[PDB]
Amino acid sequence: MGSMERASLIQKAKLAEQAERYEDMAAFMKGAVEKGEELSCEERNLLSVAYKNVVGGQRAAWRVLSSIEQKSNGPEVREYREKVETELQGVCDTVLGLLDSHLIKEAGDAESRVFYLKMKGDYYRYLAEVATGDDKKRIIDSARSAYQEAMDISKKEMPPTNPIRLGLALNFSVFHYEIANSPEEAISLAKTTFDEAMADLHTLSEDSYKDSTLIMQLLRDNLTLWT
C-alpha cells in the first residue's frame, strides 16, 4: 500500500467495513500504520475492528477443525488444521509487529497506550489459544505482561467507567479464565471492575452512561456463565 495516500487508505478501510470486506480493511489499515504517523482514536478503532474480525474468523475455523481432529483421535484433518493455524499465527504476528514497530513506543497518552497494550495482550492470547507446551508458557507470559502494563496505566489515568479501561478488564478476565487457568482471578477482576464502574455511573452523561453500561453487561454475562 506504499503508493496510496494515508487518507485514501483510511477512507477505503471505512468502505471495506461497510462492505464486510475485513481482509481488505486490515490491509488498508496496515498500510496506514506503515505511513509512520500516530493514529487518532477513530483510526485505532478501524485497525482493531479489521484485525479482530479477520482473526475471529480464523479462530472459529480453527475450533471447528480442532474439534473434528480430536474426535478422529489419514493426515488431512491435521494438515488442514495446521494450515489454518499457521495463517492465524501469521496474522497475529503481523498485528504484534505493527504494535512493536512503532505504535506502542510512540503512544504517550493513556488512551492510546492502553488501547495498544490491550491489543498486544489480545494477540498474544490468540497465539496462546493454539500453542502447546513450553512455547505456550512464554506466549502466555507475554500476554499477561501486556495486559498488566495496560491495567496499571488505566487504574492511574482513567476513571473506572472509561470504556477502554472496562474492555481491557473484560479481556484480561477472559485471559485469566480461559488461558491462565485462574478462574478465581477472572471472577474477582470482573466483579471488582463491575462494582467500581457502577459507583462512578452518576458522573456520566446519557451517552457515556450507555457505553459504560453496555460493557458492564458483558462483564455480568461472563460472571453469570462462570458462577
Partner: peptide, 9 residues
C-alpha cells in the same frame, strides 16, 4: 466467555 466486540453492535 465473551471478550470485547470490535463495534458497540
Amino acid at each position: 466467555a465473551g471478550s470485547i466486540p470490535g463495534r458497540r453492535s
